[PDB]
Amino acid sequence: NYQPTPEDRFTFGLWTVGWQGRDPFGDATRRALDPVESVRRLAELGAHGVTFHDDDLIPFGSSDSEREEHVKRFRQALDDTGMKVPMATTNLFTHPVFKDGGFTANDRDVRRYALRKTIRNIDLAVELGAETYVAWGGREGAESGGAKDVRDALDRMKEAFDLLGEYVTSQGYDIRFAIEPKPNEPRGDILLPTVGHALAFIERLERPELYGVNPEVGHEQMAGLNFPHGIAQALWAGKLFHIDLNGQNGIKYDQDLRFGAGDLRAAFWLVDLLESAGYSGPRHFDFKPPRTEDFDGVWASAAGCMRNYLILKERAAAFRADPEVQEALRASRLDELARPTAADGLQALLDDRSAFEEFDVDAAAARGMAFERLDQLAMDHLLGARG
Amino acid sequence: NYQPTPEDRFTFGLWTVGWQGRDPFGDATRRALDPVESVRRLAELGAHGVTFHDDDLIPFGSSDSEREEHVKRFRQALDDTGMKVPMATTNLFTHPVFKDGGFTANDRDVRRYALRKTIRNIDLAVELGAETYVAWGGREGAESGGAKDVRDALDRMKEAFDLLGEYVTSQGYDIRFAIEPKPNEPRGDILLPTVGHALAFIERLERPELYGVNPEVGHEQMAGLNFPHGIAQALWAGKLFHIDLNGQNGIKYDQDLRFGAGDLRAAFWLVDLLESAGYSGPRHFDFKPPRTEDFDGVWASAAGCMRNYLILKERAAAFRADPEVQEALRASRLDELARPTAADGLQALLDDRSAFEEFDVDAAAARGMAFERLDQLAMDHLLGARG
Amino acid sequence: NYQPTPEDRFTFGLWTVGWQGRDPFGDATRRALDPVESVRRLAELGAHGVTFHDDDLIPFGSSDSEREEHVKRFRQALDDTGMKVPMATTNLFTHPVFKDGGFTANDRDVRRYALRKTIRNIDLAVELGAETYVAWGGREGAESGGAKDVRDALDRMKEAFDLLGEYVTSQGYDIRFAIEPKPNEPRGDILLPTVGHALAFIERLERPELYGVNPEVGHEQMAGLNFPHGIAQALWAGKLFHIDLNGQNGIKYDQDLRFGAGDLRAAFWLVDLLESAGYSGPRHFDFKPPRTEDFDGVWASAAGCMRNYLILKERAAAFRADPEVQEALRASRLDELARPTAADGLQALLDDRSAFEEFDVDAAAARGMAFERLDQLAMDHLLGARG
Amino acid sequence: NYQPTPEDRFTFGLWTVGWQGRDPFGDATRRALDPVESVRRLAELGAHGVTFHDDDLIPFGSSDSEREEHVKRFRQALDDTGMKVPMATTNLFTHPVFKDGGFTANDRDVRRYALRKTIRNIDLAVELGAETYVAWGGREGAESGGAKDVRDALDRMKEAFDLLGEYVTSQGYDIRFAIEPKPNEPRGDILLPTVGHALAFIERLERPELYGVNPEVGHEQMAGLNFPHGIAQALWAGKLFHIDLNGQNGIKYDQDLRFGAGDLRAAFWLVDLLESAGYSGPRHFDFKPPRTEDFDGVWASAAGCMRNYLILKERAAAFRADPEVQEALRASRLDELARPTAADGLQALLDDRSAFEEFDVDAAAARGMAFERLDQLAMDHLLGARG
Ligand SMILES: [Ca+2]
Ligand SMILES: [Ca+2]
Ligand SMILES: [Ca+2]
Ligand SMILES: [Ca+2]
Ligand SMILES: [Mg+2]
Ligand SMILES: [Mg+2]
Ligand SMILES: [Mg+2]
Ligand SMILES: [Mg+2]
User: B317, B325, C385, D213: least surrounded by Cβ within 10 Å?
Assistant: First the structure.
């Protein structure tokens, strides 16, 4: 049961299944993977495609002839399997040159290098068929208050994203950008730390229509926020261009557990919302198989990501379709929430004595919301315990 | 030393010094205060003014003749002392009718009542001279996933704020709105949970120029966020209309400690930023004297709010003016952060071999940022330990 | 399905279903309940019994004749229903006299009053048949560093618990004590903030055998801790005398959601551990029906507590009994974890070349733990998705 | 001013100043340091000594002749400078063999290897003059619930520590053990996650007198706990054998900032407590110079650790010595906190009508604690703002 197929649009970063297991306190526990092997093994599990940072596909420092050969071998693996590349991104965080940032480094020469490195990889992403170009500014931020003037850094961030938008327009590319928030780690505090901050920033760009968000489950949860609520605001804004799916157990280091692990009920409400809203983009997993695992465990963890999405999709659809749930939603006035407050207009509201002078506040206050019965029907559906 | 005067623009809510000490587990520890007594005692400490919820000034349910008398006595106290009223707000959270929200209650009749209650108090706020009208939607949100469709709630929130903007325009009022974020408490999750989310929402209103933020120190810190960074983004956007100052010790219930308490270094960097940016609005305290205190302790805690702001203002100004600090800022390339990345333009950047083909990445990576020396100069200034 | 009966040992505090809905920002949303009505309604849902604070059963300040009548009516309700009283406790936190603590108040006269108030209620608890007497020191702690010398406070805490142990021994009572940790709320920091701190403190009492812990799900989770791990340590120590079951969504104010809500996977692992260990005490719920609810919603939320325990008990038992899970546990070396490291003794270990000189560290490191496959079998069992 | 000397007992791990800057998302930013150079540079800053993991001093895998030469060169550097080695520890976390733990690995052969590796380094630690042997079980724990039976793991942990105590007794060594808690990172949850849990565990060892704690500032703060409160409980128990000093900004990844950074007021209250209690052990720093820094910045950050301790020591001593503070402490009844509750005994307390029957609860409740005035005197002392 719950078998994934390419039509489900599940995708994985090369760096996910390829993670060698180096952590803040430990050496690698697995050998490096050839990208060709990852494309083949993910296709065998029912994935739709893969994503990459520049430096995952082409080792940093490669000659032009070595670059050509790495791309040629990867394209053959895509052609052998039917796998797609819907998204790509730039590594602006591993190399020591990026220790104070890429686009917002205090050193101007590093900012210019970061833009040239990104532009080179936008060309490659378009050649491989990507629709979305992600930016995770993991080095943009500070450990101390004097190190980074945040207004100046936001000016540099806007300048960078405006130049990238000029570039893609000049080349006639159809690709769009997606900014990925994170609140902290590896910097003490990261700029644009949540979905809200990234959405607000985009409204100051010269061409806002070219930019949206790539929210990650565990990143919003590292600020103790409700991930489904933040996704709802992104959808409300028309800005959910891509998503990163994984798990996280509360406020700690970025765990990148397989999807479904961590906050299981939040995963349920997330899938319910994506499916109800008709989100059509990739279901992308940004996860780390724990370093306890061998290669067999890597593929088991990847398979589990897709399995858990499909279980949750079934249970959320059954919840929404149940006539007893539909009655409970009316008892809780979810239908009234979706009606305008005052389609009669401001003057009519001011002249309505039933809205103030003759409003029975005590009778309204006495009416229970019936939310606990609704939520226990949701629990029963998630757990397969309906009686 | 560090004596406040009205020119410092320190203001306090009636509900701050007037808090009777009821908490989630305990009864009141202090008698109610007459607003007239609070105006008098705050003026004697060097405050500039006071703010109010409707129901702090006029007991809920008052007749028109009782309302007139409560306002008359308050206006006499303002006239007796020279105290101002720069901000007012609505209580859309105490009465049981608001148990599922005001503007985003699932019950439509409660949404309409919430708007009429707000409009009545906007008229009073203008009569008393307020420049800013705050909205804290403390009941807007949920404990469970099915109870609140967040896209529908955001539609109702926008409708409410658009009607309020229509109202103030129709009356020719000069007053502006400020939305106050909070991530949780009293709801399990609150809508518009951070500065970023509120800034993004405002860009979808019909008249965005009429709306800004009222960020509170402790509320951003309840999400583990950097409060100075969020203030910098609000300033970058042109949206810092008002601020709430207090203290908070990390991720827990909303403590509302006196300003300076909680995260002392964050308080330093906050004052540094407000003063460097030339923020001109009220320095408003939203705090609770702990319920351990008697009335003498209430006034001691209020005095401490203002004293700590003035100490931090002195130390931040000395830091920025120190020639050794100015040299350290250049050593750390803060001057280069404020210069454009590519004022030469996109084509020049693409044709610059020094930005990619001939960029010496290893020499750039070897250059230390000197941030620890800069931060220890900042510590020495805060603590009065310069040698 | 999943119907509770008295034999399941589910119990509820009077103050749970009786919570009127006053929160840090809002007035009551429900009328007070007569304890007689709560005993009757809980019995009808399949509960085993009820628990009380002194002041829940007898209003504070009652005459001796009023006290007798309140106890008489309650005893009749217990006799009418077959309901038991396995635990009682003291309210040392609501009345303003306890604003700086009961047993660790800085005022000595308040410490002595707190002990007399507790002793009176121990006599009543024994008369009603309680086996456990809980202490939650919610007011013991501080908002500021100078207010409370913690070594002195721990001396006063030990003196109090030693006097209570002397009292119960002198009367020949069989009752035992259980200390309930909480990290914060209503104090900025509470003394004995976790299970570990309470276990360590007990080892310094004169009669340690008389004292154990009453851990609460949401309280350990307010420190971001793993509740099942802390329960395992309490069991290891022989000190799990009682437990409080509820839900919590991470690091925030104390939510007291119904059991099963909050961290669902942690609830699964908790039930697995209680059942595997043969815990025999009450399954007690310390929860708040949200203030959105009317009386029908109160009883629905109470019913849901018991239903979720029974669903999780079924799924955990099926996991442990599955032969495929038993094979996965051996593949992950859980059997080897339970074997002694060196039953051969220290000298044999020192003389064993296979433990150092001839140990093949690279072959051992290459062996995968197979934990992801084991955890996805656990997920499949929880969700009723086994194929 | 604030110049450290060896008599201040400041010590540093080799791995602190020697950290090359590899983080969860980035490569090294600094070359490796020779231990001889670190001993020399730290002595020049006024340090007292250094500490080491086995593998910091002797590269993993070294021949016996290479081991002898590494120790010989290090001993010469100690003799050249007068530097001491008061503490050492084992690296049971970097090598991939320890991916599921050392003492609590599910694989028995790894548990035995972990003990042999520790014993070899205890012999070396004694040869170099160490008084304390630290254990940080950073790999002991789990990412998932089925992977680790915590009762079985605690049995293996006790067996390991009991064997180490047998070993040191058999050799007639005077060295004692100190367990270092951490709540998470690199495991999803770590066993013995706080000071309380470690203190409780020690009471179950065969020879409890041989074991205490090594608490770290940032580790307790990763659980949102009050570090000074936890130190007070360790001191109350007689178990503060050693301490790790650093900074942390709330609930996130382990930052290991220089001491004084992070929560500055908590650092003040910590130093106040260590000095008031007469703690006599090393003032050890476990910190990371941020990877933004070059070698000059490494030594600046190390110097800042010691400077901040000495500033805070001065301010705390001035607070406690101020007659106005001494009067405020009496006004707040800190003197009464230190007096027994009932030195008259249980029967006298029961017969005292002033403790219950004739206790005026309303007069006691009306008495303010005066804690805000006391705390603003503490703020004024910290900031050098006394008027
Ligand atoms: Ca992540
Ligand atoms: Ca607040
Ligand atoms: Ca609770
Ligand atoms: Ca650390
Ligand atoms: Mg991601
Ligand atoms: Mg506020
Ligand atoms: Mg409880
Ligand atoms: Mg340490």
Answer: B317
Give the type of residue at B214. N
- Across the beta sheet with D176-179, the strand order is D211-213, D176-179, D132-135, D87-89, D49-53, D10-13, D283-285, D244-245
How far, in Å, CA of C56 to CA of C47, rounded? 19
Q: For residue B42, which of B20, B22, B15 has the smallest C-alpha distance?
A: B15
Chains in contact with chain A (at least 3 beta-carbon pairs closer than 8 A): B, C, D
| Catalytic residue from among D48, D53, D242, D381 | D53
In 3D space, the residue among C62, C242, C187, B149 whose CA is nearest the CA of residue A235 turns out to be: B149
Chain centroid offset of residue B205 CA: 21
Give the integer Cα–Cα distance in Å for B216 and B180.
7
Closest CA to C69 of C79, C55, C58: C58
- Domain boundaries of chain A, sorted by first residue: 1-387
Residues whose CB falls within 8 Å of the CB of residue C66, separated by 6 or more in sequence, listed in order:
C58, C59
In angstroms, what separates the C-alpha of B221 from chain D's closest C-alpha? 9
Q: Write out the two tokens for D285.
A: 């720093």
Helices B371-382 and D295-321: crossing angle in degrees, nearest 10, is: 10
CA angle B121, B125, B128 (to 5 degrees): 140
3-state SS record for A80-108? HHCCECCEEECCCCCCHHHCCCCCCCCCH
Q: What is the CATH number of domain C1-387?
A: 3.20.20.150
Q: Are strands C189-190 and C141-142 parallel, antiparallel or unpaired?
A: antiparallel
- Whole-number Å distance between alpha carbons of C122 and C175: 9
Catalytic status, residue D189: no
Residue among D147, D186, D257 minimizing CB distance to A143: D257
Query: At CA B81, angle to CA B80 and CA B87, rounded to 5?
Result: 115
Determination method here? X-ray
Which one, of B192, C307, C293, B144, lies nearest residue A272 by Cα?
A: B144
Residues 6+ apart with CB under 8 A from A189: A141, A142, A183, B225, B226, B229, D249
Is D194 close to C191, i.e. CB distance below 8 A? no
Which ligand number lies closest to the CA of residue D216?
8
The residue among C3, C299, C311, C376 with the most chain A CBs within 10 A of its CB, best to mutate, is C376
Outline where chain A has alpha helix (H).
14-17, 35-44, 54-57, 64-81, 108-127, 150-171, 195-202, 217-221, 227-236, 264-277, 295-321, 323-331, 334-337, 346-351, 361-366, 371-382
Buried b (16+ CB within 10 A) or exposed e, B142-157: bbbbbbbbbebbbbbb
What is the DSSP secondary structure assignment for residue C275, as one 8-state letter? H
> CB contact, 8 Å: A333 with chain D?
no
Is B53 among the catalytic positions? yes
Please check whether residue B252 is in contact with residue C143, taking contact to mean a CB–CB distance below 8 angstroms.
Answer: no
Interface test with B, best of C143, C216, C308 (most B CBs within 10 A): C143
How is C225-244 classified by DSSP, letter by letter?
--HHHHHHHHHHTT-B---E
Report in angstroms the alpha-carbon separations of C377 from C162, C318, C325.
48, 11, 7
Chain D residue numbers with beta carbons less than 8 Å from the beta carbon of A137 are none
Asked whether residue A360 is marked as a ligand-binding residue, the answer is no
- In the C/D pair of chains, how many CB contacts fall below 8 A? 317
Q: How far apart are CA A1 and CA D218, in angstroms?
A: 46
Which of A48, A54, A55, A56 is the catalytic position? A56
Enumerate residues with CB within 5 Å of ligand 2 (an ion): B 218, 254, 256
**Resolution, Å (one decimal):** 1.0
The type of residue at D68 is E
